Amino acid sequence: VAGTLRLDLAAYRELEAFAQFGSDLDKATQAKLARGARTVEVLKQDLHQPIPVEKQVLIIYALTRGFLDDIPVEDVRRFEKEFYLFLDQNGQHLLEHIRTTKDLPNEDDLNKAIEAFKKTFVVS
Amino acid sequence: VAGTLRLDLAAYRELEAFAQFGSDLDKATQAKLARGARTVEVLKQDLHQPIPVEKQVLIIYALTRGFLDDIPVEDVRRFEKEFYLFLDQNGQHLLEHIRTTKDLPNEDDLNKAIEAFKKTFVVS
Amino acid sequence: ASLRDIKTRINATKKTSQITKAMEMVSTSKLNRAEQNAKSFVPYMEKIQEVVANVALGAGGASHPMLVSRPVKKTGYLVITSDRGLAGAYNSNVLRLVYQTIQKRHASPDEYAIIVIGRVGLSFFRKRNMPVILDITRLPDQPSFADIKEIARKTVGLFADGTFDELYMYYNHYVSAIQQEVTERKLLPLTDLAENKQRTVYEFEPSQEEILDVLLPQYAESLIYGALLDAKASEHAARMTAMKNATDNANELIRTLTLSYNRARQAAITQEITEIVAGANAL
Amino acid sequence: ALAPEIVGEEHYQVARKVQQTLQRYKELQDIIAILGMDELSDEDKLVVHRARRIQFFLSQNFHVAEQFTGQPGSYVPVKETVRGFKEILEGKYDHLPEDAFRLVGRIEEVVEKAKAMGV
Amino acid sequence: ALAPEIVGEEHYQVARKVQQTLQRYKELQDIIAILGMDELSDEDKLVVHRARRIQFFLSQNFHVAEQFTGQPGSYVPVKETVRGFKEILEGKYDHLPEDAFRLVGRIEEVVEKAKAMGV
């Protein structure tokens, strides 16, 4: 997932020089700007709060596959926190699989877990 | 002839910016862009091949007197190359006149010589 | 600051100048293509108006020149704006004048009525709370009569059947390519005309009234279309001048930042030379 | 000492939001200078509107500056500073003139000064 | 070495044309980003269509990148690469997706990758 993150962030930073010219641009450009802003909000982190890699990979997957694109920008931090809490009680097999095999779990199962959490998430 | 050449080159270098969409008659397309384009084309020179001052005078006079208005921009170089040979073949009187007196020859004689050459030239 | 500090801002401002100049060129070509439609439209409007000059005179009318003038009930108002900004106060003048005059002359949402063209008008009226009835979100940079024809027909039909009292259009004219300003005019009742009679006895093959009843709506649509063409020309001229002034200001900033950078780097260099000389002298 | 566990989460949030708004206002200066104020988006206009007022409200009249200027000076508790800046951030005083905030103490003196000027 | 008699007339022609197309494409990024590419003239849109493919074709998979990616490398002769660029310029491959041209060797392998992805 890191390659996809790099590509998205590079496109965002290249296009950022034009975001000063209003909110009306080519229809793909504002979507790219929204994705870049969401990545910027995800990469933020508080002090003395290290994150295990098995949770980092999951949240970056959720970001990069577009599961986060319906959530507004200012709710991303709360989404990440609630998502870690949800993963603590459910989908523990995902964490164990990643932690023991250094690879992503079943594709369909991960999507199902993301959808299950997105159902119980609440938006402001 | 150098003074006449200078202004055309300066005007073209000034108006190079608006080349994509020119519609204001000559101010945008004729004798302000086309003349400059042909000037730039005749100022190109091949490597390690100098040419005599009389032939330079002939070609610059031809450019400035509008005798190249009909030639396409991509054929001006071949026009000049053929014109040098035509001069060597017929304009010995004009070339010797310049090489001796350091002055331009008769206007009508020179114009009829270039018109005779244009009769034999073929556009590609 | 540092040379490293200065270079980034110089780069950003140079890129801004580039973009503004490119947009200025595009607006110039758009204006050149935009004036052609006004040239084509003038004969149609004049030829319809000259027929009106004898058909619509000497008669009571079909409630258009009768001045039905219902005092206050959602009398219509036409607002024509752009869709993209970068035009300076072009849209601001129109929206400001419309809001002020309509708030001065009207005070009840039932007395109010607005028809808006372009995205920014809707985007501003969402900040406000005005009762919009219909809209056209976008129009190609070379709008034809047929492009706006259906909405013009809808609005003129709403004027008909007594639903709408009378209409005013608010849009920008241009004194020249460099100056653009606002006008408003009272459209449907048609209080002014001129009188000449050439075939006044018999131009009326079905009848006098019937041809007028359908000729008037088409005339009003033509008037709205002409106002639209003038608004488009004003918009393109406004973006031309706005980008020109923006590029000029950016170039001024380039000049100032460049002088500062060049003067700072020389002080740094002479500091380095002083250090070298003193170090040599110490031994 | 500017850490949440030391001064309180409310204080930390207010300080960080103030600094963020000021940094955005600083970054917008060149585009304001070249492209004009009106070309700014609706959010950036609000950012500038709040940022100028915060920048002016940071000023204060000191006791020992009574010699330079006739104003007697003021002493402002941290709680009052936090509450006033929070109210400014949430847009309670967007309609007051800019000069009302300059060189005063607590938030209420801004209201009194605006009333004196007629707001 | 990029001279007509050193590399050949065809090689010089192809290289000069590729450089011209890329340089022209460099002027349209901001315009395309701000105003939708639909407002550009028809020729310019086709120029952009070709420039994207040229840029993606300039990349190549290396033998030493085996460790970095897991894909074996390729060696492209100069005659084959100039013919491939000439074909792309003259348009007998405008019907393929741009993702096909990335990190690949000869022009035939581009068609093979496009067929693999399902064109």
UniProtKB/TrEMBL annotation, chains A, B:
<feature type="binding site">
    <location>
        <position position="45"/>
    </location>
    <ligand>
        <name>ATP 1</name>
    </ligand>
</feature>
<feature type="domain" description="ATP synthase alpha subunit C-terminal">
    <location>
        <begin position="1"/>
        <end position="117"/>
    </location>
</feature>
<feature type="binding site">
    <location>
        <position position="46"/>
    </location>
    <ligand>
        <name>ATP 1</name>
    </ligand>
</feature>
<protein>
    <recommendedName>
        <fullName>ATP synthase subunit alpha</fullName>
    </recommendedName>
</protein>
<feature type="binding site">
    <location>
        <position position="45"/>
    </location>
    <ligand>
        <name>ATP 2</name>
    </ligand>
</feature>
<comment type="function">
    <text>Produces ATP from ADP in the presence of a proton gradient across the membrane. The alpha chain is a regulatory subunit.</text>
</comment>
<comment type="similarity">
    <text>Belongs to the ATPase alpha/beta chains family.</text>
</comment>
TrEMBL record, chain C:
<dbReference type="GO" id="GO:0042777">
    <property type="term" value="P:proton motive force-driven plasma membrane ATP synthesis"/>
</dbReference>
<dbReference type="GO" id="GO:0005886">
    <property type="term" value="C:plasma membrane"/>
</dbReference>
<keyword id="KW-1003">Cell membrane</keyword>
<protein>
    <recommendedName>
        <fullName>ATP synthase gamma chain</fullName>
    </recommendedName>
</protein>
<keyword id="KW-0472">Membrane</keyword>
<comment type="function">
    <text>Produces ATP from ADP in the presence of a proton gradient across the membrane. The gamma chain is believed to be important in regulating ATPase activity and the flow of protons through the CF(0) complex.</text>
</comment>
<keyword id="KW-0375">Hydrogen ion transport</keyword>
<comment type="subunit">
    <text>F-type ATPases have 2 components, CF(1) - the catalytic core - and CF(0) - the membrane proton channel. CF(1) has five subunits: alpha(3), beta(3), gamma(1), delta(1), epsilon(1). CF(0) has three main subunits: a, b and c.</text>
</comment>
<dbReference type="GO" id="GO:0046933">
    <property type="term" value="F:proton-transporting ATP synthase activity, rotational mechanism"/>
</dbReference>
<dbReference type="InterPro" id="IPR023632">
    <property type="entry name" value="ATP_synth_F1_gsu_CS"/>
</dbReference>
<dbReference type="InterPro" id="IPR035968">
    <property type="entry name" value="ATP_synth_F1_ATPase_gsu"/>
</dbReference>
<keyword id="KW-0406">Ion transport</keyword>
<dbReference type="InterPro" id="IPR000131">
    <property type="entry name" value="ATP_synth_F1_gsu"/>
</dbReference>
<keyword id="KW-0813">Transport</keyword>
<keyword id="KW-0139">CF(1)</keyword>
TrEMBL record, chains D, E:
<protein>
    <recommendedName>
        <fullName>ATP synthase subunit beta</fullName>
    </recommendedName>
</protein>
<comment type="function">
    <text>Produces ATP from ADP in the presence of a sodium ion gradient across the membrane. The beta chain is the catalytic subunit.</text>
</comment>
<comment type="similarity">
    <text>Belongs to the ATPase alpha/beta chains family.</text>
</comment>
<comment type="function">
    <text>Produces ATP from ADP in the presence of a proton gradient across the membrane. The catalytic sites are hosted primarily by the beta subunits.</text>
</comment>
